[PDB]
Amino acid sequence: AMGLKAAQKTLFPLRSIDDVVRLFAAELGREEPDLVLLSLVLGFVEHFLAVNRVGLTYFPVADLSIIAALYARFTAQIRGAVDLSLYPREGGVSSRELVKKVSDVIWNSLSSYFKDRAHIQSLFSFITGTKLDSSGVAFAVVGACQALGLRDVHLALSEDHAWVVFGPNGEQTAEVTWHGKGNEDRRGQTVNAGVAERSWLYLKGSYMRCDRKMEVAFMVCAINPSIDLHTDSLELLQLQQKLLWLLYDLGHLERYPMALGNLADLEELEPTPGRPDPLTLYHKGIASAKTYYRDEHIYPYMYLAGYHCRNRNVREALQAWADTATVIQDYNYCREDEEIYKEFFEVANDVIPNLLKEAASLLEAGGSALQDPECFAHLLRFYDGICKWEEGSPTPVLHVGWATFLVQSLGRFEGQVRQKVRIVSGTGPVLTFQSEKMKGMKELLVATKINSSAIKLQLTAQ
Ligand SMILES: N#C/C(=C\c1ccc2c[nH]nc2c1)C(=O)NCCN1CCOCC1
Protein backbone atom coordinates (compact mmCIF):
# COMPACT_ATOMS: atom_id res chain seq x y z
CA ALA A 1 0.00 0.00 0.00
CA MET A 2 1.85 3.10 1.21
CA GLY A 3 5.18 3.38 3.00
CA LEU A 4 7.54 0.69 4.23
CA LYS A 5 6.59 -0.87 7.57
CA ALA A 6 8.69 -2.40 10.34
CA ALA A 7 7.13 -5.80 9.58
CA GLN A 8 8.74 -5.62 6.14
CA LYS A 9 11.95 -3.86 7.21
CA THR A 10 12.75 -6.46 9.88
CA LEU A 11 13.18 -9.15 7.16
CA PHE A 12 16.12 -7.27 5.54
CA PRO A 13 18.74 -7.80 4.52
CA LEU A 14 17.65 -10.32 1.87
CA ARG A 15 20.71 -12.56 1.52
CA SER A 16 19.19 -15.59 -0.21
CA ILE A 17 16.41 -16.98 -2.35
CA ASP A 18 14.59 -18.15 0.78
CA ASP A 19 14.88 -14.68 2.39
CA VAL A 20 13.09 -13.29 -0.65
CA VAL A 21 10.42 -15.97 -0.38
CA ARG A 22 9.96 -15.09 3.30
CA LEU A 23 9.31 -11.42 2.44
CA PHE A 24 6.72 -12.46 -0.18
CA ALA A 25 5.00 -14.85 2.26
CA ALA A 26 4.75 -12.00 4.80
CA GLU A 27 3.35 -9.59 2.20
CA LEU A 28 0.82 -12.12 0.87
CA GLY A 29 -0.57 -12.39 4.39
CA ARG A 30 -1.68 -8.74 4.24
CA GLU A 31 -4.74 -7.25 2.55
CA GLU A 32 -2.60 -4.97 0.36
CA PRO A 33 0.73 -6.63 -0.47
CA ASP A 34 3.05 -3.77 -1.36
CA LEU A 35 3.51 -4.09 -5.13
CA VAL A 36 6.28 -1.41 -5.29
CA LEU A 37 8.40 -3.09 -2.60
CA LEU A 38 8.02 -6.52 -4.11
CA SER A 39 8.76 -5.43 -7.68
CA LEU A 40 11.81 -3.46 -6.58
CA VAL A 41 13.13 -6.48 -4.69
CA LEU A 42 12.64 -8.86 -7.65
CA GLY A 43 14.11 -6.35 -10.10
CA PHE A 44 17.16 -5.80 -7.90
CA VAL A 45 17.83 -9.55 -7.49
CA GLU A 46 17.23 -10.29 -11.18
CA HIS A 47 19.45 -7.40 -12.29
CA PHE A 48 22.47 -8.76 -10.43
CA LEU A 49 21.77 -12.48 -10.99
CA ALA A 50 21.18 -12.25 -14.77
CA VAL A 51 24.88 -12.12 -15.68
CA ASN A 52 27.36 -14.93 -16.26
CA ARG A 53 29.73 -15.30 -13.33
CA VAL A 54 32.68 -17.12 -11.85
CA GLY A 55 31.79 -18.56 -8.46
CA LEU A 56 29.68 -21.57 -7.58
CA THR A 57 27.41 -19.73 -5.18
CA TYR A 58 26.29 -16.13 -5.32
CA PHE A 59 23.49 -13.99 -4.17
CA PRO A 60 23.28 -10.17 -4.45
CA VAL A 61 22.36 -8.85 -1.02
CA ALA A 62 19.28 -6.59 -1.07
CA ASP A 63 20.20 -4.10 1.68
CA LEU A 64 17.19 -2.22 3.07
CA SER A 65 18.85 1.16 2.43
CA ILE A 66 19.03 0.52 -1.33
CA ILE A 67 15.49 -0.80 -1.60
CA ALA A 68 14.11 1.90 0.72
CA ALA A 69 15.81 4.66 -1.25
CA LEU A 70 14.44 3.37 -4.58
CA TYR A 71 11.02 3.01 -2.96
CA ALA A 72 11.08 6.59 -1.68
CA ARG A 73 12.09 7.90 -5.11
CA PHE A 74 9.10 6.19 -6.75
CA THR A 75 6.63 7.33 -4.07
CA ALA A 76 7.86 10.94 -4.14
CA GLN A 77 7.71 10.95 -7.93
CA ILE A 78 4.08 9.79 -7.90
CA ARG A 79 2.81 11.86 -4.97
CA GLY A 80 4.46 15.00 -6.32
CA ALA A 81 2.87 14.66 -9.76
CA VAL A 82 -0.71 13.70 -8.78
CA ASP A 83 -2.78 16.14 -6.72
CA LEU A 84 -5.54 13.98 -5.30
CA SER A 85 -7.52 17.07 -4.24
CA LEU A 86 -8.15 17.76 -7.96
CA TYR A 87 -9.90 14.36 -8.38
CA PRO A 88 -13.00 13.91 -6.21
CA ARG A 89 -13.36 10.21 -5.46
CA GLU A 90 -17.09 9.48 -5.13
CA GLY A 91 -17.78 6.09 -3.58
CA GLY A 92 -14.38 4.39 -3.42
CA VAL A 93 -14.11 4.60 -7.20
CA SER A 94 -11.37 6.24 -9.22
CA SER A 95 -12.40 8.57 -12.01
CA ARG A 96 -11.28 7.77 -15.54
CA GLU A 97 -9.55 11.16 -15.44
CA LEU A 98 -7.53 10.24 -12.34
CA VAL A 99 -6.51 6.88 -13.84
CA LYS A 100 -5.38 8.60 -17.05
CA LYS A 101 -3.35 11.14 -15.06
CA VAL A 102 -1.44 8.39 -13.24
CA SER A 103 -0.91 6.58 -16.55
CA ASP A 104 0.52 9.68 -18.24
CA VAL A 105 2.86 10.35 -15.28
CA ILE A 106 4.38 6.89 -15.73
CA TRP A 107 4.30 7.31 -19.51
CA ASN A 108 5.96 10.75 -19.57
CA SER A 109 8.75 9.40 -17.33
CA LEU A 110 10.02 6.78 -19.76
CA SER A 111 13.26 7.17 -21.70
CA SER A 112 14.40 6.10 -26.98
CA TYR A 113 15.36 2.50 -26.23
CA PHE A 114 14.72 -1.04 -27.50
CA LYS A 115 11.37 -1.69 -25.79
CA ASP A 116 11.64 -5.52 -26.28
CA ARG A 117 14.79 -6.06 -24.21
CA ALA A 118 15.06 -8.43 -21.26
CA HIS A 119 15.00 -7.36 -17.59
CA ILE A 120 13.18 -4.05 -18.09
CA GLN A 121 9.94 -5.35 -16.64
CA SER A 122 10.23 -4.30 -12.98
CA LEU A 123 9.96 -1.05 -11.03
CA PHE A 124 13.72 -1.42 -10.49
CA SER A 125 14.15 -0.81 -14.22
CA PHE A 126 11.72 2.12 -14.14
CA ILE A 127 13.36 3.91 -11.21
CA THR A 128 17.01 3.35 -12.09
CA GLY A 129 16.95 3.61 -15.89
CA THR A 130 13.46 4.91 -16.78
CA LYS A 131 12.89 1.89 -19.07
CA LEU A 132 9.91 -0.51 -19.09
CA ASP A 133 8.64 -3.17 -21.46
CA SER A 134 5.01 -3.22 -22.60
CA SER A 135 3.27 -4.91 -19.67
CA GLY A 136 5.77 -3.40 -17.24
CA VAL A 137 4.16 -0.03 -18.00
CA ALA A 138 0.72 -1.38 -17.07
CA PHE A 139 2.12 -2.96 -13.91
CA ALA A 140 3.81 0.36 -13.04
CA VAL A 141 0.54 2.24 -13.43
CA VAL A 142 -1.15 -0.19 -11.02
CA GLY A 143 1.72 0.14 -8.54
CA ALA A 144 1.47 3.94 -8.65
CA CYS A 145 -2.29 3.75 -8.11
CA GLN A 146 -1.70 1.53 -5.07
CA ALA A 147 0.84 4.09 -3.85
CA LEU A 148 -1.92 6.74 -4.01
CA GLY A 149 -4.52 4.58 -2.25
CA LEU A 150 -6.64 3.83 -5.33
CA ARG A 151 -7.77 0.44 -4.12
CA ASP A 152 -10.02 -0.17 -7.11
CA VAL A 153 -7.31 0.14 -9.82
CA HIS A 154 -6.10 -3.29 -10.92
CA LEU A 155 -4.12 -5.08 -13.60
CA ALA A 156 -6.02 -6.77 -16.43
CA LEU A 157 -4.33 -9.35 -18.67
CA SER A 158 -5.08 -11.25 -21.81
CA GLU A 159 -2.82 -13.95 -23.24
CA ASP A 160 -0.85 -11.25 -25.11
CA HIS A 161 -1.56 -7.79 -23.63
CA ALA A 162 -2.16 -5.76 -20.45
CA TRP A 163 -4.21 -2.75 -19.37
CA VAL A 164 -6.01 -1.59 -16.22
CA VAL A 165 -9.48 -1.86 -14.71
CA PHE A 166 -11.14 0.22 -12.01
CA GLY A 167 -14.53 1.26 -10.64
CA PRO A 168 -17.11 -1.18 -9.21
CA ASN A 169 -16.10 -4.78 -9.93
CA GLY A 170 -13.59 -3.45 -12.44
CA GLU A 171 -16.35 -2.27 -14.75
CA GLN A 172 -14.12 0.48 -16.20
CA THR A 173 -11.16 -0.33 -18.46
CA ALA A 174 -8.35 1.85 -19.78
CA GLU A 175 -5.37 1.26 -22.07
CA VAL A 176 -2.10 2.45 -20.50
CA THR A 177 0.63 0.88 -22.65
CA TRP A 178 1.40 -0.07 -26.23
CA HIS A 179 0.94 -3.38 -28.00
CA GLY A 180 2.85 -4.90 -30.91
CA LYS A 181 4.92 -2.87 -33.36
CA GLY A 182 3.49 0.17 -35.18
CA ASN A 183 -0.18 -0.02 -34.16
CA GLU A 184 -1.94 3.22 -33.31
CA ASP A 185 -1.79 4.39 -29.68
CA ARG A 186 -5.02 3.45 -27.88
CA ARG A 187 -3.99 4.75 -24.46
CA GLY A 188 -6.86 6.30 -22.59
CA GLN A 189 -9.49 4.27 -24.48
CA THR A 190 -11.58 1.40 -23.08
CA VAL A 191 -10.94 -2.13 -24.35
CA ASN A 192 -14.58 -2.61 -25.46
CA ALA A 193 -13.78 -2.33 -29.18
CA GLY A 194 -11.32 -5.22 -28.94
CA VAL A 195 -13.78 -7.28 -26.91
CA ALA A 196 -16.53 -6.49 -29.42
CA GLU A 197 -14.47 -7.51 -32.45
CA ARG A 198 -14.04 -11.04 -31.01
CA SER A 199 -10.24 -10.85 -31.45
CA TRP A 200 -8.00 -13.29 -29.57
CA LEU A 201 -6.13 -10.28 -28.17
CA TYR A 202 -9.03 -9.44 -25.85
CA LEU A 203 -10.29 -13.03 -25.31
CA LYS A 204 -13.96 -12.15 -26.01
CA GLY A 205 -13.90 -10.41 -22.59
CA SER A 206 -12.80 -13.62 -20.82
CA TYR A 207 -9.58 -11.91 -19.70
CA MET A 208 -8.02 -11.84 -16.23
CA ARG A 209 -9.05 -9.16 -13.73
CA CYS A 210 -6.40 -9.26 -10.97
CA ASP A 211 -6.81 -8.66 -7.27
CA ARG A 212 -3.68 -7.48 -5.41
CA LYS A 213 -2.55 -11.04 -4.80
CA MET A 214 -2.90 -11.97 -8.48
CA GLU A 215 -0.82 -8.87 -9.28
CA VAL A 216 1.85 -10.43 -7.07
CA ALA A 217 1.48 -13.63 -9.07
CA PHE A 218 1.90 -11.58 -12.28
CA MET A 219 5.18 -10.06 -11.16
CA VAL A 220 6.46 -13.54 -10.22
CA CYS A 221 5.57 -14.91 -13.67
CA ALA A 222 7.33 -11.83 -15.07
CA ILE A 223 10.72 -12.83 -13.55
CA ASN A 224 13.06 -13.41 -16.51
CA PRO A 225 15.88 -15.91 -15.71
CA SER A 226 17.41 -15.56 -19.20
CA ILE A 227 21.06 -14.43 -19.08
CA ASP A 228 21.83 -14.81 -22.80
CA LEU A 229 20.51 -16.87 -25.71
CA HIS A 230 22.06 -20.06 -24.31
CA THR A 231 21.86 -19.61 -20.52
CA ASP A 232 19.26 -19.27 -17.76
CA SER A 233 19.97 -18.28 -14.16
CA LEU A 234 19.35 -21.34 -12.00
CA GLU A 235 18.90 -19.07 -8.98
CA LEU A 236 16.20 -17.02 -10.70
CA LEU A 237 14.39 -20.17 -11.85
CA GLN A 238 14.44 -21.56 -8.30
CA LEU A 239 13.17 -18.25 -6.88
CA GLN A 240 10.31 -18.09 -9.40
CA GLN A 241 9.41 -21.74 -8.73
CA LYS A 242 9.40 -21.31 -4.94
CA LEU A 243 7.29 -18.14 -5.19
CA LEU A 244 4.78 -19.81 -7.51
CA TRP A 245 4.35 -22.69 -4.98
CA LEU A 246 3.78 -20.09 -2.26
CA LEU A 247 1.13 -18.40 -4.40
CA TYR A 248 -0.33 -21.81 -5.32
CA ASP A 249 -0.70 -22.85 -1.65
CA LEU A 250 -2.50 -19.65 -0.69
CA GLY A 251 -4.94 -20.05 -3.60
CA HIS A 252 -3.76 -17.13 -5.70
CA LEU A 253 -3.11 -19.23 -8.85
CA GLU A 254 -6.70 -20.59 -8.86
CA ARG A 255 -7.78 -18.12 -11.56
CA TYR A 256 -4.39 -17.80 -13.30
CA PRO A 257 -4.04 -20.50 -16.00
CA MET A 258 -0.73 -19.20 -17.43
CA ALA A 259 0.90 -19.25 -13.96
CA LEU A 260 -0.17 -22.87 -13.49
CA GLY A 261 1.37 -23.74 -16.88
CA ASN A 262 4.55 -21.87 -15.94
CA LEU A 263 4.67 -23.83 -12.66
CA ALA A 264 4.19 -27.16 -14.47
CA ASP A 265 7.03 -26.28 -16.88
CA LEU A 266 9.30 -25.47 -13.92
CA GLU A 267 8.34 -28.76 -12.23
CA GLU A 268 9.13 -30.63 -15.45
CA LEU A 269 12.51 -28.86 -15.38
CA GLU A 270 13.10 -29.67 -11.71
CA PRO A 271 10.49 -31.63 -9.73
CA THR A 272 9.77 -30.61 -6.14
CA PRO A 273 9.49 -33.70 -3.88
CA GLY A 274 5.93 -34.15 -2.67
CA ARG A 275 4.31 -31.80 -5.19
CA PRO A 276 1.78 -32.61 -7.94
CA ASP A 277 3.41 -33.74 -11.17
CA PRO A 278 3.46 -31.48 -14.26
CA LEU A 279 0.54 -33.26 -15.95
CA THR A 280 -1.66 -32.63 -12.91
CA LEU A 281 -0.66 -28.94 -12.99
CA TYR A 282 -1.28 -28.58 -16.75
CA HIS A 283 -4.76 -30.02 -16.29
CA LYS A 284 -5.36 -27.63 -13.40
CA GLY A 285 -4.54 -24.75 -15.73
CA ILE A 286 -7.08 -26.11 -18.22
CA ALA A 287 -9.62 -26.65 -15.42
CA SER A 288 -9.06 -23.02 -14.35
CA ALA A 289 -9.66 -21.71 -17.88
CA LYS A 290 -12.84 -23.78 -18.20
CA THR A 291 -14.11 -22.68 -14.77
CA TYR A 292 -13.34 -18.94 -14.76
CA TYR A 293 -12.74 -18.02 -18.41
CA ARG A 294 -15.42 -19.93 -20.39
CA ASP A 295 -12.76 -22.25 -21.88
CA GLU A 296 -11.79 -19.37 -24.17
CA HIS A 297 -7.99 -19.45 -23.50
CA ILE A 298 -5.46 -20.93 -25.95
CA TYR A 299 -2.30 -21.35 -23.88
CA PRO A 300 -3.65 -23.91 -21.35
CA TYR A 301 -3.80 -26.42 -24.21
CA MET A 302 -0.53 -25.21 -25.84
CA TYR A 303 1.25 -25.73 -22.49
CA LEU A 304 -0.09 -29.28 -22.32
CA ALA A 305 0.71 -29.87 -25.97
CA GLY A 306 4.36 -28.80 -25.56
CA TYR A 307 4.81 -31.15 -22.62
CA HIS A 308 3.39 -34.13 -24.51
CA CYS A 309 5.51 -33.20 -27.51
CA ARG A 310 8.73 -33.02 -25.47
CA ASN A 311 7.96 -36.41 -23.99
CA ARG A 312 7.09 -37.88 -27.43
CA ASN A 313 3.49 -38.74 -26.47
CA VAL A 314 2.38 -38.08 -30.04
CA ARG A 315 -1.32 -38.95 -29.62
CA GLU A 316 -1.82 -36.70 -26.60
CA ALA A 317 0.25 -33.91 -28.14
CA LEU A 318 -1.99 -34.03 -31.22
CA GLN A 319 -5.15 -34.20 -29.10
CA ALA A 320 -4.03 -31.11 -27.19
CA TRP A 321 -3.21 -29.21 -30.37
CA ALA A 322 -6.62 -30.08 -31.79
CA ASP A 323 -8.08 -28.65 -28.57
CA THR A 324 -6.22 -25.37 -29.21
CA ALA A 325 -7.80 -25.20 -32.66
CA THR A 326 -11.26 -26.03 -31.27
CA VAL A 327 -10.88 -22.98 -29.00
CA ILE A 328 -9.51 -20.70 -31.71
CA GLN A 329 -12.30 -21.42 -34.23
CA ASP A 330 -14.73 -19.27 -32.29
CA TYR A 331 -12.52 -16.16 -32.64
CA ASN A 332 -12.14 -13.75 -35.53
CA TYR A 333 -8.55 -13.21 -36.69
CA CYS A 334 -7.81 -9.50 -36.26
CA ARG A 335 -5.06 -6.95 -36.83
CA GLU A 336 -3.06 -7.65 -33.63
CA ASP A 337 -3.57 -11.41 -33.08
CA GLU A 338 -0.31 -12.10 -34.94
CA GLU A 339 1.44 -13.80 -32.00
CA ILE A 340 -1.15 -16.58 -31.94
CA TYR A 341 -1.06 -16.85 -35.73
CA LYS A 342 2.69 -17.49 -35.40
CA GLU A 343 2.19 -20.25 -32.82
CA PHE A 344 -0.38 -22.13 -34.92
CA PHE A 345 1.90 -21.73 -37.96
CA GLU A 346 4.91 -23.37 -36.27
CA VAL A 347 2.71 -26.14 -34.90
CA ALA A 348 1.18 -26.92 -38.30
CA ASN A 349 4.25 -26.48 -40.51
CA ASP A 350 7.20 -27.42 -38.26
CA VAL A 351 6.46 -29.23 -34.99
CA ILE A 352 3.77 -31.59 -36.28
CA PRO A 353 5.82 -32.49 -39.41
CA ASN A 354 8.96 -33.26 -37.36
CA LEU A 355 6.98 -35.25 -34.80
CA LEU A 356 5.54 -37.21 -37.72
CA LYS A 357 8.95 -37.53 -39.41
CA GLU A 358 10.43 -38.99 -36.23
CA ALA A 359 7.50 -41.40 -35.94
CA ALA A 360 8.13 -42.45 -39.56
CA SER A 361 11.85 -42.99 -38.88
CA LEU A 362 10.87 -44.95 -35.78
CA LEU A 363 8.68 -47.32 -37.77
CA GLU A 364 11.09 -47.52 -40.73
CA ALA A 365 13.50 -48.91 -38.11
CA GLY A 366 10.97 -51.51 -36.90
CA GLY A 367 2.75 -50.00 -32.37
CA SER A 368 3.29 -46.56 -33.89
CA ALA A 369 0.93 -43.61 -33.66
CA LEU A 370 0.83 -43.31 -37.45
CA GLN A 371 -1.05 -46.63 -37.10
CA ASP A 372 -3.52 -45.01 -34.66
CA PRO A 373 -6.55 -43.55 -36.49
CA GLU A 374 -7.27 -41.52 -33.34
CA CYS A 375 -4.08 -39.58 -34.06
CA PHE A 376 -5.27 -39.00 -37.63
CA ALA A 377 -8.64 -37.84 -36.29
CA HIS A 378 -6.85 -35.40 -33.95
CA LEU A 379 -4.83 -34.17 -36.93
CA LEU A 380 -8.05 -33.51 -38.86
CA ARG A 381 -9.77 -31.79 -35.93
CA PHE A 382 -6.76 -29.48 -35.61
CA TYR A 383 -6.93 -28.44 -39.26
CA ASP A 384 -10.74 -28.21 -39.12
CA GLY A 385 -10.44 -25.68 -36.29
CA ILE A 386 -8.00 -23.43 -38.17
CA CYS A 387 -10.23 -23.39 -41.25
CA LYS A 388 -13.29 -22.26 -39.26
CA TRP A 389 -11.10 -19.67 -37.52
CA GLU A 390 -10.28 -18.17 -40.91
CA GLU A 391 -13.98 -18.11 -41.85
CA GLY A 392 -15.41 -14.68 -41.20
CA SER A 393 -11.95 -13.16 -40.82
CA PRO A 394 -10.44 -10.59 -43.22
CA THR A 395 -6.78 -11.57 -43.04
CA PRO A 396 -5.95 -14.71 -45.10
CA VAL A 397 -4.89 -17.40 -42.61
CA LEU A 398 -4.09 -20.49 -44.66
CA HIS A 399 -1.97 -20.18 -47.80
CA VAL A 400 0.34 -22.16 -50.08
CA GLY A 401 2.84 -22.62 -47.24
CA TRP A 402 0.34 -24.44 -45.02
CA ALA A 403 -0.72 -26.50 -48.03
CA THR A 404 2.36 -28.67 -48.47
CA PHE A 405 2.73 -29.76 -44.86
CA LEU A 406 -0.97 -30.60 -44.57
CA VAL A 407 -0.71 -33.14 -47.38
CA GLN A 408 2.72 -34.30 -46.20
CA SER A 409 1.20 -35.02 -42.78
CA LEU A 410 -1.79 -36.88 -44.26
CA GLY A 411 0.57 -39.12 -46.21
CA ARG A 412 2.26 -40.09 -42.94
CA PHE A 413 -0.76 -42.38 -42.41
CA GLU A 414 -1.59 -45.33 -44.67
CA GLY A 415 -5.07 -45.59 -46.15
CA GLN A 416 -6.08 -48.57 -44.01
CA VAL A 417 -5.49 -46.48 -40.89
CA ARG A 418 -7.13 -43.35 -42.29
CA GLN A 419 -10.18 -45.22 -43.60
CA LYS A 420 -11.14 -46.13 -40.02
CA VAL A 421 -12.37 -42.63 -39.03
CA ARG A 422 -15.93 -41.72 -40.03
CA ILE A 423 -16.03 -38.05 -41.07
CA VAL A 424 -19.39 -36.31 -40.56
CA SER A 425 -20.30 -32.93 -41.98
CA GLY A 426 -21.48 -30.57 -39.27
CA THR A 427 -24.84 -29.09 -40.37
CA GLY A 428 -13.26 -46.53 -35.29
CA PRO A 429 -13.30 -42.82 -34.48
CA VAL A 430 -16.19 -40.56 -35.44
CA LEU A 431 -15.32 -36.96 -36.27
CA THR A 432 -17.60 -34.02 -37.09
CA PHE A 433 -16.31 -31.22 -39.34
CA GLN A 434 -17.21 -27.58 -38.67
CA SER A 435 -15.53 -25.65 -41.52
CA GLU A 436 -16.38 -25.19 -45.21
CA LYS A 437 -13.02 -26.27 -46.59
CA MET A 438 -12.59 -29.41 -44.50
CA LYS A 439 -16.19 -30.40 -45.22
CA GLY A 440 -15.16 -30.11 -48.89
CA MET A 441 -12.25 -32.58 -48.83
CA LYS A 442 -14.24 -35.04 -46.65
CA GLU A 443 -13.57 -38.02 -48.94
CA LEU A 444 -10.19 -37.00 -50.41
CA LEU A 445 -8.68 -37.27 -46.89
CA VAL A 446 -9.46 -41.02 -46.74
CA ALA A 447 -8.58 -42.27 -50.29
CA THR A 448 -5.88 -45.01 -50.63
CA LYS A 449 -3.90 -42.37 -52.61
CA ILE A 450 -3.85 -38.67 -51.76
CA ASN A 451 -5.01 -36.14 -54.37
CA SER A 452 -2.23 -33.62 -53.76
CA SER A 453 -2.99 -30.69 -56.07
CA ALA A 454 -6.69 -31.08 -55.15
CA ILE A 455 -6.29 -30.86 -51.36
CA LYS A 456 -3.65 -28.19 -52.01
CA LEU A 457 -6.17 -25.89 -53.71
CA GLN A 458 -9.26 -26.57 -51.59
CA LEU A 459 -7.30 -25.36 -48.54
CA THR A 460 -5.73 -22.25 -50.11
CA ALA A 461 -9.11 -21.23 -51.54
CA GLN A 462 -10.76 -17.82 -51.06
N1 LIG B 1 4.48 -16.82 -26.08
C2 LIG B 1 4.02 -17.03 -25.05
C3 LIG B 1 3.35 -17.29 -23.81
C4 LIG B 1 3.03 -18.54 -23.41
C5 LIG B 1 3.14 -19.86 -24.04
C6 LIG B 1 2.78 -20.98 -23.27
C7 LIG B 1 2.83 -22.26 -23.78
C8 LIG B 1 3.25 -22.43 -25.10
C9 LIG B 1 3.45 -23.53 -25.97
N10 LIG B 1 3.87 -23.13 -27.15
N11 LIG B 1 3.97 -21.77 -27.09
C12 LIG B 1 3.60 -21.31 -25.87
C13 LIG B 1 3.55 -20.02 -25.35
C14 LIG B 1 2.97 -16.23 -22.94
O15 LIG B 1 2.32 -16.51 -21.91
N16 LIG B 1 3.35 -14.98 -23.24
C17 LIG B 1 2.46 -13.83 -23.17
C18 LIG B 1 1.97 -13.48 -21.78
N19 LIG B 1 1.31 -12.16 -21.76
C20 LIG B 1 0.60 -11.91 -20.50
C21 LIG B 1 -0.04 -10.55 -20.52
O22 LIG B 1 0.90 -9.51 -20.75
C23 LIG B 1 1.57 -9.74 -21.99
C24 LIG B 1 2.27 -11.08 -22.00
Q: What is the DSSP string of 20-54?
A: HHHHHHHHTTSSS--HHHHHHHHHHHHHHHSS--S
Does the beta carbon of 219 lie inside 6 Å of ligand 1?
no
Atom from ligand 1 closest to the CA of residue 265: 7
Q: How far apart are CA 250 and CA 266, in angstroms?
A: 19
Q: Report CA dihedral (445, 446, 452, 454) to the nearest 10 degrees.
A: -60
Contact 217, 344 (CB under 8 A): no
Cα–Cα distances in Å, from 236 out to 19, 139, 222, 267, 462?
13, 20, 11, 14, 49
Give the resolution value in Å.
Answer: 2.0
Establish whether residue 306 lines the binding site of ligand 1, counting it when its CB lies within 6 angstroms of any ligand atom. Answer: yes
Contacts of 178 (CB under 8 A, 6+ apart): 115, 134, 137, 185, 187
How far apart are the C-alpha atoms of 359 and 408, rounded to whole Å? 13
CB 396 within 8 A of CB 386: no
Question: 257-269 and 234-250 are packed helices; what angle lies between their axes, rounded to 10 degrees?
Answer: 130
Sign of CA dihedral 309, 457, 434, 206: positive
* Pocket probe mutation, ligand 1, options 135, 207, 301, 302, max atoms within 8 Å of Cβ: 302
- What Rg, from alpha-carbon coordinates, does the chain have? 25
In the reported structure, the alpha carbon of residue 262 is separated from the centroid of ligand 1 by a whole-number distance in angstroms of 9
Edge to edge, the sheet with strand 154-157 lists 172-174, 162-166, 154-157, 208-209
Atom of ligand 1 nearest to the CA of 305: 9
Q: How many helices (DSSP H) and strands (DSSP E) are in the chain?
A: 21, 8
Mapped onto helix, strand or coil, the DSSP state of residue 77 is helix
Choose which residue among 132, 163, 164, 258 to substitute to test ligand 1 binding: the one with the highest number of ligand atoms within 8 A of its C-beta.
Answer: 258
Residue 295, classified by CB atoms within 10 Å of its CB into exposed (0-12), middle (13-18) or buried (19+), is middle
Q: Which helix (H) or strand (E) holds 291?
A: helix 278-292
Q: Which helix (H) or strand (E) holds 430?
A: strand 430-433
Does residue 161 have its Cβ closer than 6 Å to ligand 1?
yes
Cα separation, 172 vs 164, in Å, equals 8
Q: Could you tell me how far CA 270 lies from the centroid of its own chain?
A: 21
162 CB near ligand 1 (under 6 Å)? yes
Give the closest residue (by CA) to ligand 1 atom 1.
Answer: 339
CA-CA-CA-CA dihedral for 229, 235, 240, 242, to nearest 10: 150
Can you give the residue ranges of every domain in the chain? 1-462
Residue having the nearest C-alpha atom to atom 14 of ligand 1: 159
SS3 322: helix
SS3 content of the chain, % helix, strand, coil (to 5): 55, 5, 40
Q: Tell how strand 422-425 and strand 172-174 pair up.
A: unpaired
Amino acid (one-letter) located at 75? T
Do the beta carbons of residue 391 and residue 433 sit within 8 Å?
no
Q: Ligand 1 atom 7: the closest Cα is on which residue?
A: 303
Q: Which residues of 2-20 are buried (b: 16+ CB within 10 A; e: fewer)?
A: eebeeebeebbebeebebb
Q: Which amino acid is at 188?
A: G
Query: Does 258 sit in the ligand 1 pocket, CB within 6 Å?
Result: yes
- What ligand 1 atom has the least distance to the C-alpha of 138? 22
Please state, in angstroms and as integers, the Cα–Cα distance from residue 78 to each residue in 33, 69, 75, 81, 164, following that order: 18, 14, 5, 5, 17
Ligand 1 atom closest to the Cα of residue 262 is 6
Is the CB of residue 299 below 6 angstroms from any atom belonging to ligand 1?
A: yes
Pocket test for ligand 1, best of 219, 226, 299, 346 (most atoms within 8 A of CB): 299
Nearest CA to ligand 1 atom 19: 160
CA atoms within 13 A on the CB side of 439: 10
303 lines ligand 1 (CB under 6 A): yes
Ligand 1 centroid to 258 CA: how many Å? 7
**For the purposes of burial, counting CB atoms within 10 Å of the CB of 300, is it exposed (0-12), middle (13-18) or buried (19 or more)?**
buried
- Report the C-alpha gap between 23 and 25 in whole angstroms: 6
Q: 80, 100 in Cβ contact below 8 A?
A: no
H or E segment to which residue 425 belongs: strand 422-425
Atom of ligand 1 nearest to the CA of 343: 11
Q: Say how far apart CA 161 and CA 434 lie, in whole Å.
A: 29
Rounded to the nearest whole angstrom, what is the distance from the C-alpha of residue 5 to the centroid of ligand 1? 35
Distance 160 CA to ligand 1 centre (A): 7
- In the chain, the amino acid numbered 303 is Y
CB atoms within 10 A of CB 251: 9
3-state per-residue secondary structure call for 121-180? CCHHHHHHHCCCCHHHHHHHHHHHHHHCCCCCCEEEECCCCEEEEECHHHCEEECCCCCC
DSSP string, 181-242: SSPPP-TTS-SHHHHHTT-GGGGGG--EE--HHHHHHHHHHT---EEETTEE-HHHHHHHHH
SS3 1: coil
Distance CA 147, CA 144 (A): 5
Burial of 81 (0-12, 13-18, 19+ CB in 10 A): middle
**Residue 160 near ligand 1, beta carbon < 6 Å:** yes
State the chain's maximal CA–CA distance in angstroms. 78
List beta partners, residue 231.
228
Question: How far is the centre of ligand 1, averaged over its atoms, from the C-alpha of 388 (Å)?
Answer: 23
Distance 301 CA to ligand 1 centre (A): 12
